[PDB]
Design a protein around this ligand. Sequence first.
Ligand SMILES: [Cl-]
Length: 228
Amino acid sequence: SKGEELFTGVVPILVEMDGDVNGRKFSVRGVGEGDATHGKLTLKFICTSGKLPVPWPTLVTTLVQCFSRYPDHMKQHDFFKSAMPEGYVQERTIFFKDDGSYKTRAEVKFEGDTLVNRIVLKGTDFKEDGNILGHKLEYNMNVGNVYITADKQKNGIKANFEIRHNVEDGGVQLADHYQQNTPIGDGSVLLPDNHYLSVQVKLSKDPNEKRDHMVLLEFRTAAGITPG
Ligand SMILES: [Cl-]
């Protein structure tokens, strides 16, 4: 890409989320930076409406796959950078097993030299004493492997993956993700062969921060195609 030229160094990131779960409105802002040459990004998120009504880990996938590192033999398969700077709309539906669902729509694009992820999330039908509204999930994140394929119905790509959220005192809460990304521009974008993004996340807290928050470190690598 010429889009890939925009990712040769550290890129600042701004994330904004307007959320609503079972009618309860909330907002999140995140700031940080990503470096695709290191397949790494770091973000700190604050709940800018007080206390978060769902567990932080359930929002990780919603809250910039542009920073995945594609190896040389897979560069032709990086849709995300190819769509830049005009960007793409990412839509997901996330189904929490035996509980409610999130519907998300985000625009990801450069605004000047900052990458911006602007999100609206709406969650419906959650159980008041379920794992989500009840805050019964551990503060951590398991590895996710996002399987990407060309979308033959709309312009761009689709993906499917399931996230396992550890539940306090044992067991898991599954979150089944459906994803579509559609370029914003009219310009040509790369159409990838099937592959996946392997994503590892470490969640932490800022010892000096009294607001409800999440510090995220994330490593993301493309794979699923043997070298050559
Ligand atoms: Cl267990």
